Symmetry: C3
Subunit: 160 residues, 3 copies
């Protein structure tokens, strides 16, 4: 039951999000939406992204009863593909450790295996030139989230 | 030196806490107290729980000098049994990784082996139908915290 | 290119920071600076430390453009030695899991192998008398951060 593809772009606190607009305008048969972390918003302005932006607070403001919706859940059953550009050293360790403390990491931890989750770490030489990152990126591969160590990402989205 | 049993119920951010009142009114020779996470309080109202509710802020407001008490510590030497109903996918990963960033997870990480800590994960099909949860729940078993994958829990509390 | 040694003292939320001033006044050819966590500041007052104190907020207030500086980065290229006295059970698990959610843990996760990072866990009998702490302290040794399970620390700083 798929027509226009539903892609969900997750954004974290890396200077890379500075470029996030580019990704959106490009990536936009696709049909997108971005979900951010708070710090990520430190690299771009909402207006510079012509799409629906879901944030932590967004989830809780719409829930007041068991009848009410569960944004992170609602978003997980809506995306056909979940791209996370960029994935910071922090969220990597959160995901690596099944830590859902924000709307993003929760969408991920509730993800659908059946659907694809391509990510692309984007830290700094230092943070990257450290161990864990490896023991974690592949530890993350254990769930096969298609790494990507703009452009490259863009094309890679499709690849039907 | 035990008369009336001291049970400590921990509550996290799962819709399950919606039921938390039930547990309390039932579980209440037992003598209880609940310790929550902030988000958990998103599923119940304090008044609907006829017991002392300890929260993060509670710890710090009472400490101003080395002489002063350490709530999370004080609570760890007071409970005979520590039930955590529900344990969310998030706190599981916190506990799994020895992460004490809130009054709950700290009480746990300072726990007494000598005393029992029965817990019961309570996420959603998705979040649960994911890996880590397993590599973690049993990773958590390594410390033997008696899983429980209301009712069932209730009875299980006792079982002298 | 080293003259006066640059030591960076990290402080976390353990009652031990109560003593932090001592360390500073002593440790001060050395030339120091302290980087704290928020909770840590619950055990000492800034004024009681005659040095530049870097805090989370400090990083973000100085960054508004890609041209702008990256405190946690700037601090990582400036320290010759990074001592973390005390390292709480919490930050241990953060570091263990490559979790940079605050200025401290970020400086660490971006650390320079080439430079030394001596730390000294400082929790409580309980929190310490637990497993993970071990599977973690040595898991932390994997990156060789020179444990130290005031005084002892002080001398140990030097040891040219
Ligand atoms: C100016 C600046 C640039 C940063 N750049 C990066 C980066 O490129 N990659 C990374 O992993 N972390 C970077 N960080 C650290 C993260 O912002 C910090 O880990 C944050 O907690 C991540 O939060 P999040 O996971 O909610 O987005 C940077 C911090 C600052 C102040
Ligand atoms: C309406 C709603 C329902 C949620 N239900 C669950 C759940 O049933 N299980 C779970 O692990 N997380 C659930 N979450 C996500 C947690 O609330 C989020 O992980 C939170 O950070 C946990 O915080 P805590 O550990 O401080 O309680 C839900 C979020 C929302 C908004
Ligand atoms: C009075 C008091 C004393 C505490 N002492 C310690 C301690 O000695 N060691 C430890 O690991 N945690 C201790 N904690 C718990 C930490 O403060 C809590 O884990 C905190 O989140 C650590 O935050 P940080 O990593 O940002 O500093 C204490 C808490 C309180 C209220």
């Amino acid at each position: 039951m798929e027509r226009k593809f539903h892609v969900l772009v997750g954004v974290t606190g890396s200077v890379a999000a500075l470029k996030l607009p580019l990704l959106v305008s490009k990536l936009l048969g696709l049909e997108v939406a971005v979900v951010t972390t708070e710090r990520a918003k430190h690299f771009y302005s909402p207006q510079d992204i012509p799409v629906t932006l879901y944030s932590d607070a967004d989830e809780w403001e719409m829930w007041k009863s068991r009848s009410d919706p569960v944004l992170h859940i609602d978003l997980r059953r809506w995306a056909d593909l979940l791209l996370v550009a960029p994935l910071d050293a922090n969220t990597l360790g959160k995901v690596a450790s099944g830590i859902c403390d924000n709307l993003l990491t929760c969408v991920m931890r509730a993800w659908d295996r059946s659907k694809p989750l391509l990510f692309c770490p984007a830290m700094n030489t230092a943070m990257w030139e450290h161990p864990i990152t490896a023991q974690q990126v592949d530890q993350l591969k254990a769930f096969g989230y298609v790494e990507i160590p703009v452009g490259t990402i863009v094309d890679k989205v499709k690849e039907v």
